[PDB]
Amino acid sequence: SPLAAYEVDDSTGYLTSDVGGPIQDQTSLKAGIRGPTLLEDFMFRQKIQHFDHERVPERAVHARGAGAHGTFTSYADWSNITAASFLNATGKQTPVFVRFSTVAGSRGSADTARDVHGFATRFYTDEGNFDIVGNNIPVFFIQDAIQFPDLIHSVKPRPDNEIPQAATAHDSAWDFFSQQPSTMHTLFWAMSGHGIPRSYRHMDGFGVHTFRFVKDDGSSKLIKWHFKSRQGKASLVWEEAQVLSGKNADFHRQDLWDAIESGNGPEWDVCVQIVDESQAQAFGFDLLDPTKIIPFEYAPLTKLGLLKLDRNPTNYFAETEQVMFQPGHIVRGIDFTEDPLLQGRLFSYLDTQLNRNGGPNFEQLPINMPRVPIHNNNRDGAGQMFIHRNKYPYTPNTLNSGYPRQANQNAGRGFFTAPGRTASGALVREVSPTFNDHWSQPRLFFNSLTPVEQQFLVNAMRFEISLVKSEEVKKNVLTQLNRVSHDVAVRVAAAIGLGAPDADDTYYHNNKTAGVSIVGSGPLPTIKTLRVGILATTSESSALDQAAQLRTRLEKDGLVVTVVAETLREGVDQTYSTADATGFDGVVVVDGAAALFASSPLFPTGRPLQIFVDAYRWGKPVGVCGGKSSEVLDAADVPEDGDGVYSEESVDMFVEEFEKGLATFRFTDRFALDS
């Protein structure tokens, strides 16, 4: 609605200045034809001044990201647990905007870096804008907001040379992790496949903190936000992620964009765990501690409604870059908790938009505006876009009849702090002892992964820690890893040539929890949008017929099909020169193209075979369609009897097998395990 009035159409008409004067903008005004440019050329200067000033500071964290518009729909009337208006009726729709992100990388860094990921949702409710500023991992590195600059300095590039971009694989980061043991839980998550998701659509969103749901009668409950993907959970493998960072730094934002443009807008079930106030310390840890989850088995999920993203921005800068989220954007029916991480966040997000926007009127940016009337006595500031009629903007007043009126629990649907909340004791800068177990939950997480998944995590740690130059930091890292799992410490130690310390079993246990494994979460529930590369050739006209037949059968099922050949022509989407295994979720070679899989000026040596080999090694469904073709499989050293390897002459039988493979998504039997 506020976005509508600000849309600007330039599909017709003559070029104007910003003040509506028709102009030209292609040649400077000069003193003679070979002469110097004139100062009086206002056309030149308004244009270049605009350009010179296009850039704004990137966000201090979550700089790299992308967004889309959509809709949230409540499944019910939730007034029995919260007064929140956007949740007060079956079927009620509220517009949203969501921005997904990495954390550590700058603008222009690669989508498929290993990192924590942001998932930020604005609900433009009929009682004000409500932001849930979440991550794809349910726990956070630190226990007090005052530590955030310490964390972020450590994981961002070394400040002498600004190396390395968008990576925790350097001394400073592991120095911090090894010296601040709270970090263990999030570190384990980030080193799992949760650090390299297949897409923004294939990860979940978490509020992380415990919040409160507050009823109109003042009573409250403690809650965790969970956004559960309806597309299923899925990851890249690390080697794939690295190549993909170079071949397509825009992989995640292109995936999101394309899914929306094809009518496959991603969906999430917006859910909570709800527990009584008396359960703050019932589960063997403290619900004020943002390094802990409530295990699935302790508190079930309640589905509140549906989040769907279904429209892409018109202007990335105006909408995506300028959207300014705040946990301070709260509505009646929600309240904060005394989580020391959350508490400090409230300050940060209000302050940081002054940096980004360069002035205090950032909530007037159309993407930031609400969809209800604004009544308040805030005035002036740079970039003030309103013209206020109330000339007595103070309370209390008689000269504007006491308007605007105070809103509170009993008037005007005012926000109110949960009336049960209290404080007692000295004013201290001390950590609660209830926050001290940094290791049990990391172990819970690790115990809940499948064997190959645990191997992947060990291999990510081996990769990163092997890049750490300081022997002391490496020792220190092993000391912390050892407190979570001796086994992990032994396995990682083996790769970096140190001895693991002796087992210290204080926090060791064998318990598991459901819902945190990617590998173990079963087949994807939909294969729409998944990418199938078909490797073909122009040399055999039968190869293009085989590709065409495959295309029709696969596209029928909503898969995105790329036929590859030496050169472009009708039916061919990409050349071998531009193609890569990171571009596909499954790879099919047509029989007719067998000759390519053994030199050409049109593509680098061995490219067709390399795509097939890479896809196989990265765990993808691969196959040959045509029938007499032990060839290609032989050339690739891919076993015909392999899980997730397909050979059929029949196109229909091939597609039916292959689609089951796409759902399985990764064939993990192809990865070696430690003894």
SS3 label, residue 429: coil
In the complex with Ca ion, the residue whose CB is nearer, 161 or 506, is 161
20 touches, from ligand HDD, Ca ion, a copy of itself, none (C-beta below 5 to 8 Å by class):
none
In the complex with Ca ion, the residue whose CB is nearer, 135 or 172, is 172
Interface with a copy of itself in residues 386-415 (CB under 8 A): none
135 touches, from Ca ion, a copy of itself, ligand HDD, none (C-beta below 5 to 8 Å by class):
ligand HDD
416 touches, from Ca ion, ligand HDD, a copy of itself, none (C-beta below 5 to 8 Å by class):
Ca ion
Asked if residue 325 belongs to a known ligand binding site, the reply is no
In the complex with ligand HDD, the residue whose CB is nearer, 346 or 663, is 346
CB 500 within 8 A of CB 640: no
**Sheet containing 645-648, strands listed edge to edge, beginning at the edge strand earlier in sequence:** 574-575, 560-565, 531-535, 586-590, 622-625, 645-648
434 touches, from Ca ion, ligand HDD, a copy of itself, none (C-beta below 5 to 8 Å by class):
a copy of itself
Tokens 């990163």 belong to 464
E-assigned strands of 215-260?
Answer: 220-229
Q: Which amino acid is present at 264?
A: N
Asked if residue 59 belongs to a known ligand binding site, the reply is yes
How many other β-carbons are positioned within 10 Å of the β-carbon of residue 261? 11
How many other β-carbons are positioned within 10 Å of the β-carbon of residue 175? 17
Which of 59, 202, 483, 666 binds a copy of itself (CB under 8 A)? It is 59
In DSSP notation, 586-631 reads EEEEEGGGGGG----TTS-TTHHHHHHHHHHHTT--EEEESS--HH
**Could you tell me the smallest distance in angstroms from the CB atom of residue 408 to ligand HDD?**
28
**Could you tell me the smallest distance in angstroms from the CB atom of residue 63 to ligand HDD?**
8
**Could you tell me the smallest distance in angstroms from the CB atom of residue 321 to a copy of itself?**
8
Asked if residue 62 belongs to a known ligand binding site, the reply is yes
Asked if residue 148 belongs to a known ligand binding site, the reply is yes
Which of 315, 400, 436, 447 binds a copy of itself (CB under 8 A)? It is 315
Alpha-carbon distance 202 to 530, whole Å? 11
**Could you tell me the smallest distance in angstroms from the CB atom of residue 358 to Ca ion?**
4
Site membership for a copy of itself, residue 173 (CB under 8 A): no
Site membership for a copy of itself, residue 506 (CB under 8 A): no
How many other β-carbons are positioned within 10 Å of the β-carbon of residue 86? 25
Compute φ and ψ for 587, nearest 5 degrees. -130, 130
62 annotated active-site = yes
List of residues contacting ligand HDD (CB under 6 A): 48, 52, 59-62, 65, 99, 101, 118, 120, 133-135, 140, 145, 148, 208-209, 290, 323-325, 341, 344-345, 348-349, 352
Which of 33, 387, 399, 411 binds a copy of itself (CB under 8 A)? It is 33
Site membership for a copy of itself, residue 615 (CB under 8 A): no
235 touches, from Ca ion, ligand HDD, a copy of itself, none (C-beta below 5 to 8 Å by class):
Ca ion
C-alpha angle with apex 572: 571 to 578, nearest 5 degrees? 165
Question: Residue 6: CB partners within 8 Å, gap ≥ 6?
Answer: 318, 366
Alpha-carbon distance 499 to 483, whole Å? 15
Site membership for a copy of itself, residue 572 (CB under 8 A): yes
Cis peptide before 404 (omega within 30 of 0): yes
Asked if residue 283 belongs to a known ligand binding site, the reply is no
**Could you tell me the smallest distance in angstroms from the CB atom of residue 344 to a copy of itself?**
6
135 annotated active-site = yes
**DSSP 8-state secondary structure symbol assigned to residue 417:** -
Instruction: Tell me which residue of 482, 519, 517 sits closest to 499, measured CA to CA.
Output: 482
**Could you tell me the smallest distance in angstroms from the CB atom of residue 599 to ligand HDD?**
39
**Could you tell me the smallest distance in angstroms from the CB atom of residue 170 to ligand HDD?**
21
Question: Could you give the C-alpha distances from 261 to 68, 119, 122, 311, 520, in angstroms and in order?
Answer: 11, 20, 21, 8, 31
Which of 71, 79, 179, 352 binds a copy of itself (CB under 8 A)? It is 352
In the complex with Ca ion, the residue whose CB is nearer, 169 or 492, is 169
In the complex with Ca ion, the residue whose CB is nearer, 193 or 661, is 193
Please give the size of the binding site for a copy of itself, defined by CB under 8 A.
137
Asked if residue 235 belongs to a known ligand binding site, the reply is yes
Give the orientation angle of helix 471-484 with respect to helix 184-191, to 10 degrees. 100
The residue annotated as part of the active site, out of 88, 135, 357, 459, is: 135
SS3 label, residue 520: coil
Q: Which residues are annotated as a binding site for heme d cis-diol?
A: 59, 62, 99, 140, 148, 349, 353, 356
Give the catalytic positions in this structure: 62, 135
